[PDB]
Design a protein around this ligand. Structure first.
Ligand SMILES: Nc1nc2c(ncn2[C@@H]2O[C@H](COP(=O)(O)O)[C@@H](O)[C@H]2O)c(=O)[nH]1
Ligand SMILES: Nc1nc2c(ncn2[C@@H]2O[C@H](COP(=O)(O)O)[C@@H](O)[C@H]2O)c(=O)[nH]1
Lengths: 830, 830
């Protein structure tokens, strides 16, 4: 929501688009609330309270100080992710195209002949992970960098098997200008990099479910984490494959053999991590260029040993420029070995070269076998070619994207693999694997069993909510797990559809009430981002791939007003109320008509009994960052910290939301409202004195209207009690005697309350009524009725016309407790 | 599917539309199968096997003997439900409109002035329940009657609040001619009337969930049954109602006060039934016309006592023509009392008449109170008017449809109600109830808790599968209940949508694999109808409101071929195969290409390994009457009764169905296939010898083709065993030595099996192969491979052209068992 606070003295004015202006010196939390309810994208903050900036940032709303209006202000007309703890700004902005450049996260790409295939004059410039090397471009009051890169395009080109790069880059850039900004993808890079270190330091055992190739670099420094992904391609599974012949498909114009090498070595690193939770020694044979080491070293320090006749720049120690044949004993006991040996494309016939390469393949495989036969705790990966050969059945198969699909694959072998059953594999099956399979993911770990773990911190970022996963197992995991961070699809669909999908790929959808979590925060990406110290320029759109984030066993659950608060609950409510609606009063109007309070709708903008629940039910697709359930619960057990609202006040908003949904045919909001009302009636064991025996009544000295009944009284309470509780009731009355006479009782008009009932309004007594309802309910005394409480002084049982007077205070003369249908009053304090 | 068997001598021929002809004298069950696979609506059966007619009728397919071709045959060009145990034919046919008549199930309607409001010259003729009095119209070789009535139209008119009957009847009749026949509604009347007596006699405790008003007459004679419906309208729930004034809405042109009276008394009967499981004495005050008694007496004998100054025809004993005031002591102790007292519409002012009626209302209420104060086990229902009055809070409110909505309602009171808290109710609330509520259902029983009951026979005909019901509770009920008959929606939707709905009213949808029932029949309405002795002319259309019927703990589960059999599995398969497909061989072709058997597709119509599973997966929307799961299970434990098919044969069809669904983007069939393959691998613990140590080989004397290898042999088996099991294997071989030499081995052509493999086909050995696979699997010996078994004699490792010869028998010379990679053969029987 991009709130920018600039100095009041330097309150510069320009007509920027979608801007707003706010400033006030009354409270520090309500300035944040009122800012959170502004309707535009950018907000300009002029009294610039540091406290209020911190509150916004905790809520996920980006709030930063602006000191160099000349450049700081103008260079923030784009979205960004703000690390407010370290005061860092990560710009997600593709204006750098005006420099005729493509930006990448990876250094190795700069060494390929990629620039030739770009548009004429274009270059690609390395920017570092999340634009770390761009900090020179921006020298502001804060550290500033541009996290936007074109790496998605390059990776898509590599996996797309289409050849011509010029048109591909051009098409993808034009598309990027035609579609809205990929905020989720770009800010999640920052969130991953900040999140997982905090978890590894802060928690004993961290389990990450379904990592994707995007974060392959994130976990390079954290072997403590146990990863669960899709299964690996085993050799035994090649029995199903139909035999095929050589097929020379070219996928990339520029040589990407280094990307293949890097994905291979990283896959091996993570296999080793999965087996032994420690960082291994890396041994590499071949891999002469080896530039990508740099990109790995940016995330974790590793010890690299290289054997290649050419030079390898970034290696730790290039043990020998000479080739490696029988030097097995140099290899230490806790390590991984990458064997990429290609002798040479000789200038001989292709058949002769094939025999040469086949013999070389057998040599490499035997080298791997000797590597793993001698020593415990090691893993290896070999380059083989497609031929008839006998591989172990449990070995893992790798074919990552390479420049051309030309009869090569890789075999990943642990020590359990070497002495295992070996099977004969024809060249046709291996060719079928090379041609029909491209390895999608470097995480080859066994799938995650969706069971609650008591010693683990489970992290399911975008993996659990899928069409094929068991829904009830997901619900039980979220419900009963301690210490977790799990994400599901939101079900922002009308008609309450239980799945949502794109081109026959579907996801399960959940409402916040579909869970029964005891102690957890159920918020948006904004809320979860704030809980971990980040804020963002751009909120979730109501219709999109929006996810609920659920944090189980968090430090922050009891900080109700601090994290996943009601910031922005009324942003959409206010936009609709002031632009499109029939009247700005429509809300109070509808809420009173929904609770059968139509008897008078006269100036109901004052002292309405409905609550936050109405906007959390109706506009949930916008403000689901609120966590309505925790808000209700924490106010059940004070341990009402700011509000002290009676439960009937919550139930009334529930009923109003149900009627609204039925009018709009919003089936989802109808369910959500019914379920929240159920949760309320579970947390509060509410009772209704629909058949009362006694009542509390207030009597006034003067009555500014013509009255036709003998006794004008305000029925201020109605209750159902046994006689023995009359002292208890009395005590509770005494408990607020001061407060009872303190209230500023006012009346301004008379109206018809029902057929044959003519009453005078009473104002200013309702807050006291709710405090007293809370006290009676806490004391297990049945107080209140099924209907809504309407404070009124009955004037006559006749049908008379409405009369108005100026606000005339009313004065209390006695506050009595009387038995219904008994002329006997059982208490009369003055 | 309307199979009509007529005498072969009188094999009359006419060109009726959608007819077919079948006759054969080879088998009695396969004539039924082949008939069940014919594509048209009507089938003409000429060899007319009584056995085959019985088999069809057990399957749900109507199969009746035709003896009077002149009229029996021609008057069966319409659909019907056939009670084949009693040999009765219930026609559902609206041709009777050509007699200018409307047909009703209820006698009371004939006494109203309804005929005046019909179209000129039209009459309404009573036909009895399911047309019992129409048997005179048809005098055939069987008892015959027309169950079709226009009662749906009349009831809809009564509940529709639209006034003009002439246009309403005309519109509804025209609609009935424009839409297809409501078979489900009409045949379910017959099914209910036959089903529930059988259950009450056959089972101790019967529980019926969610009865609707349609079957209000069905349970009149069965107070043993405990009913669960939607809750009742309690007096205490009127606190929510907004006050209203008199509103004179007219709903019907002809007087329907008798329908109101009948619904009132029947509601009271069922309340009494719910409390005390016995038939009560019926006392009625007022209710002078009382014709509807007749309609009640048609279902159960009752004892009626009437007090009215006018005469009451069908009453048991009209105790007194004189009015009933202080005759309370005549009323017996186990009874119900209906108090419909209206003094008279005097010719005085409406206000004076209002006071008269109000005093009369108080008199009636006090009469009811005195009735219930003296005596245990009684229930009462009173006619009251809208006024201020104090009713008990727990009393039940009835407002059934009446002629005009004019300030009257009814109160249902049990003995618990009389001495209960009483509340003051204004006339406005009662008027609001009269104006805004019409009682939808005479079953006012508490809702059903979806829990398994061990002593109960639960019957959920159309109640459980609804949007708001808990899905997992439904699954657990179906899964774990004994002795039940429950119905759910089928999920015939593509894309696998979990709910289906009409105008924001949705239902849960289930596949047959969504349950894990141990001992139950999961079939169609046709199958369930057959299990209870009925058959039907018209099968379920693939896209419709089609329901799965699940019978838990049934006598019929083990009669695999008798009930819920494979009748009609291939009806749709055959229609598609011969009309639209690219070739009639497409099925065998696709099934072989799906299991990677493309190496040869030459004449695969013979000896294909796929099964029934393919058509139960692909065409489930048509043949879901099959209960594929029970078919698989019962053949798992012989206890293969006709087929003796190996499990791999089932799995192959599963894989073929998965590939087919992916090609058609039929997401539902894809899931169903995956789940059935899972069920197969659960029931059979299958093992694969993908890495074999030994093999079974057959050697032949002559080889009709040119062979380039030293030893021509048929690898007839492949297995993985420890050495110690060689005797066991040998014994099993000996177990079928005779059978092994008995088979008619034939070869007809040579083909290429893979790159560098040239083989000769082998035919006629596959059935023996499957018998032997079953024997090895039963003996816990790992036999077979992950791939499909292809019997072949390898001829050379060279790429040669295909050659064909006439069918040349091959002769076995020895059947040996040899260790793989060992020249050592370990057995050689001749
Ligand atoms: N009864 C009640 N009303 C609230 C509460 N919070 C905000 N409101 C009402 O909601 C209004 C803003 O939201 P809107 O009605 O515009 O959606 C405020 O002017 C205020 O009257 C609450 O906690 N209880
Ligand atoms: N393998 C196998 N094929 C069957 C079985 N039952 C029917 N079929 C095949 O299915 C054909 C009829 O079904 P269709 O292929 O036309 O859908 C028959 O001609 C027969 O070849 C069975 O149990 N196993």
């Amino acid at each position: 929501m991009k709130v920018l606070a600039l100095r009041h003295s330097v309150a510069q004015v320009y007509a920027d688009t979608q801007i707003y202006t706010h400033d006030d010196t009354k409270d520090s939390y309500e300035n944040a609330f009122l800012i959170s309810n502004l309707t535009t994208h950018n907000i300009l903050y002029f009294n610039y309270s540091a406290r209020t900036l911190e509150i916004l940032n905790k809520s996920g709303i980006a709030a930063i100080e602006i000191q160099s209006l000349e450049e700081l202000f103008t260079l923030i007309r784009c979205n960004f992710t703000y690390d407010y703890e370290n005061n860092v700004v990560y710009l997600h902005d593709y204006s750098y195209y005006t420099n005729n450049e493509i930006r990448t996260d990876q250094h190795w790409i700069t060494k390929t002949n990629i620039e030739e295939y770009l548009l004429p004059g274009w270059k690609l410039t390395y920017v570092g992970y999340n634009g770390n090397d761009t900090r020179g471009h921006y020298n502001f009051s804060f550290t500033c960098q541009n996290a936007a890169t074109d790496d998605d395009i390059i990776i898509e080109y590599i996996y797309s098997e289409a050849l011509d790069f010029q048109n591909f880059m051009l098409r993808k850039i034009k598309e990027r200008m035609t579609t809205s900004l990929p905020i989720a993808r770009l800010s999640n890079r920052v969130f991953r990099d900040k999140l997982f270190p905090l978890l590894v330091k802060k928690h004993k055992r961290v389990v990450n479910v379904g990592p994707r190739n995007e974060s392959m670099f994130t976990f390079l420094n954290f072997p403590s984490i146990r990863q669960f992904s899709n299964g690996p391609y085993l050799v035994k599974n090649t029995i199903k494959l139909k035999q095929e012949r050589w097929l020379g498909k070219r996928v990339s114009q520029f040589d990407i053999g280094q990307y293949k090498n890097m994905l291979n070595v990283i896959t091996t690193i993570y296999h080793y991590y999965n087996l032994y939770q420690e960082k291994p020694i890396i041994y590499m044979v071949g891999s002469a260029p080896s530039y990508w080491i740099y990109d790995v070293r940016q995330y974790s320090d590793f010890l690299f040993e290289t054997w290649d006749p050419l030079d390898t720049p970034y290696s730790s120690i290039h043990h020998k420029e000479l080739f490696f044949a029988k030097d097995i004993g140099k290899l230490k006991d806790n390590s991984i070995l990458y064997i990429d040996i290609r002798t040479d494309r000789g200038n001989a016939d292709w058949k002769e070269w094939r025999k040469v390469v086949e013999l070389q393949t057998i040599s490499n495989l035997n080298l791997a076998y000797q590597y793993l036969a001698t020593g415990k705790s090691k893993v290896c990966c070999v380059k083989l070619t497609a031929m008839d050969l006998e591989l172990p059945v449990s070995a893992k198969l790798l074919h990552h994207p390479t420049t051309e699909i030309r009869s090569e694959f890789y075999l990943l072998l642990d020590i359990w693999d070497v002495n295992n059953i070996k099977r004969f594999i024809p060249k046709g099956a291996l060719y079928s694997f090379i041609n029909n399979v491209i390895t999608d993911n470097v995480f080859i770990q066994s799938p995650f069993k969706i069971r609650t773990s008591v010693s683990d911190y489970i992290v399911a970022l975008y993996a659990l909510s899928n069409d094929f996963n068991n829904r009830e197992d997901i619900i039980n995991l979220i419900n009963n797990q301690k210490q977790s961070l799990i994400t599901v699809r939101i079900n922002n669909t009308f008609k309450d559809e239980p799945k949502v999908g794109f081109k026959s790929i579907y996801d399960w959808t959940f409402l916040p009430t579909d869970f029964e979590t005891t102690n957890a925060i159920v918020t948006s990406y904004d809320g979860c981002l704030g809980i971990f110290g980040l804020s963002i320029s751009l909120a979730s759109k109501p219709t999109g791939n929006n996810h609920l984030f659920i944090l189980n066993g968090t430090d922050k659950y009891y900080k109700l007003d601090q994290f996943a608060n009601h910031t922005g609950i009324s942003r959409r409510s206010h936009q609709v109320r002031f632009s499109e609606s029939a009247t700005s009063y429509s809300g109070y109007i509808f809420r009173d008509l929904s609770n059968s309070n139509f008897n008078l709708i006269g100036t109901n903008v004052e002292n309405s009994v409905s609550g936050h629940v109405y906007n959390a039910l109706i506009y949930y697709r916008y403000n689901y960052s609120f966590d309505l359930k925790r808000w209700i619960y924490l106010h059940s057990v004070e341990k009402g910290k700011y509000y002290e609202h009676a439960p009937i006040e919550l139930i009334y908003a529930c009923k109003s939301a149900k009627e609204f949904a039925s009018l709009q045919d919003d089936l989802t909001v109808l369910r959500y409202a019914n379920e929240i009302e159920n949760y309320i009636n579970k947390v509060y064991s509410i009772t209704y004195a629909d058949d009362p025996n006694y009542f509390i009544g207030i009597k006034f000295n003067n009555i500014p209207y013509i009255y036709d009944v003998k006794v004008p009284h305000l029925t201020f309470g109605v209750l159902y009690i046994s006689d023995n509780m009359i002292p208890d009731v009395v005590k509770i009355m005494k408990s607020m005697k001061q407060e009872l006479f303190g209230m500023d009782v006012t009346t301004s008009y008379t109206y018809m309350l029902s057929d044959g009932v003519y009453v005078a309004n009473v104002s200013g007594v309702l807050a006291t009524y709710f405090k007293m309802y809370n006290l009676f309910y806490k004391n297990q005394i049945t107080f209140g009725q099924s209907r809504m409480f309407i404070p009124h002084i009955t004037l006559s049982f006749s049908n008379n016309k409405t009369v108005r007077i100026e606000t005339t205070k009313l004065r209390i003369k006695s506050i009595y407790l009387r038995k219904i249908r008994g002329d006997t009053v059982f208490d009369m304090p003055e």
